[PDB]
């Protein structure tokens, strides 16, 4: 096996040091190209604002020390070496809830005779990303994974993007690579935009670990089916019953029961929705706005039908006149308030339903960052 001789010459005979970056002189930079393959989106449960996702982050850099003449040995074109024997540029996810900064599996690398090293270690990342609940559950979340090189500054290594070839020309991979056959869509979240960007901050200096950044954005829109079946429809129907409670005669003194019981069902729905969202105070959720609007309206319903009941049971110390007065005020109140409730619910739930993402990430950039139409 010529592999024995090749490895011994590369690592031991030449005195390979894995703690020194591969440059000829200590003024050149190491060009490190990154990609990101999203194996699957596990969940984005909103209580802790975690984006847990299995990703396949791919590296590619040049190591002049890991080079050899193929013809001198047997025709060995590809070589494999564990990471703990070769210089591995450790880039970490800067934003993550847990303490996992590196990749999950430190898999074997591939090195060519020219020194081109490629590393694709799988990783499970639980990043921290804020959630705007303003248009819940019809909301789209725009939160990303931020990768930075904390071991070397931008003066020593540079985090570029992977470049591939289609017609002899190189174009950067400016998106998260998704395997259309293998990828199965998440049961709650739909991926709309997957842009990738390299960030340079002119505020800080190149001789610093926080001058360069590579960010893999993920704009995903929730599928509003569970909530429109178990939260929206029954609440709307019981609100409709609250509105219809005015069409009940006051002779049977049992209208208060219907109104207050509908309000209590509203309280139960509030209980249910209170444990589905984070305690974020940036903006009131659309479910929260709708629920408080409808409960205020139901309280107004209760107060108004209480006024009707008090007017109905008036006495001189003729009763038909009071009964007709109560019926007239009840009909007038119904005609006033039922359209208000119907229009309010329709307006709220078409305002929420009209929340498509802007179809263009980075609003000040005409590029759509889609794999179908690359840049170069």
């Amino acid at each position: 096996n010529e592999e024995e001789r090749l490895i011994n010459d590369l690592l031991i005979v030449n005195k390979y040091n894995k703690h020194v970056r591969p440059v000829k002189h200590n003024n050149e930079v190491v060009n490190i190209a990154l990609s990101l393959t999203l194996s699957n989106l596990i969940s984005l449960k909103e209580t802790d604002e975690t984006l847990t996702s299995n990703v396949w982050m791919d590296h590619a850099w040049y190591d002049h020390r890991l080079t050899w003449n193929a013809s001198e040995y047997s025709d060995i074109s590809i070589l494999r070496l564990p990471p703990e024997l070769v210089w591995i540029p450790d880039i970490v996810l800067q934003n993550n809830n847990d303490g996992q900064y590196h990749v999950a599996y430190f898999c074997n690398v591939l090195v060519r005779p020219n020194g081109y090293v490629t590393w694709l270690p799988p990783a499970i990342f639980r990043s921290s990303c804020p959630i705007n609940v303003l248009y819940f559950p019809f909301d789209w979340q725009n939160c990303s994974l931020k990768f930075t090189a904390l071991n070397y500054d931008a003066n020593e290594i540079t985090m570029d993007l992977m470049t591939d070839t289609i017609d002899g020309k190189d174009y950067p991979i400016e998106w998260i690579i998704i395997d259309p056959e293998a990828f199965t869509e998440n049961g709650e979240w739909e991926i709309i935009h997957k842009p990738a960007k390299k960030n340079i901050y002119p505020d800080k200096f190149p001789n610093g670990t926080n001058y360069q950044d590579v960010t893999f954005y993920l704009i995903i829109r929730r599928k509003p089916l569970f909530y429109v079946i178990n939260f929206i429809t029954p609440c709307v129907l019981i609100s409709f019953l609250a509105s219809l409670a005015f069409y009940l005669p006051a002779e049977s003194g049992e209208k208060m029961s219907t109104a207050i019981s509908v309000l209590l069902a509203q309280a139960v729905f509030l209980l249910l929705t209170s444990q589905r969202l984070p305690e974020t105070a940036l903006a009131v959720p659309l479910i929260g706005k709708y629920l408080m609007f409808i409960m205020s309206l139901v309280t107004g319903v209760i107060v108004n039908c209480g006024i009707v009941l008090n007017f109905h049971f008036r006495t001189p110390s003729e009763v038909g006149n009071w009964n007709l007065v109560g019926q007239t005020i009840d009909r007038l109140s119904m005609f006033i308030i039922t359209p208000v409730m119907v229009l309010g619910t329709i307006f709220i739930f078409v305002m929420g339903n009209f929340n498509h993402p802007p179809a263009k990430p980075f609003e000040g950039d005409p590029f759509d960052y889609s794999s179908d139409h690359p840049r170069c």
Binding site: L120, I178, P180
Partner: protein, 60 residues
């Protein structure tokens, strides 16, 4: 109906089938690009291009 049943850039290979359609399926994964050839043309996941065809040996 005769059409190629090979995959990617293998040497050409044909098979006989009763369907009147023959398809070429192309998509890219984390490593490279895959071309799949066969008879008929069924539904595919989003992001995959397909080439439903009706004549003999047209999914080259």
């Amino acid at each position: 109906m005769i059409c190629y049943n090979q995959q990617s850039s293998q040497p050409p290979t044909t098979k006989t089938c009763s369907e009147t359609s023959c398809y070429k399926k192309t998509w890219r994964d984390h490593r490279g690009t895959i071309i799949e050839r066969g008879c008929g043309c069924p539904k595919v996941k989003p992001g995959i291009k397909l080439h439903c065809c009706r004549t003999d040996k047209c999914n080259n």
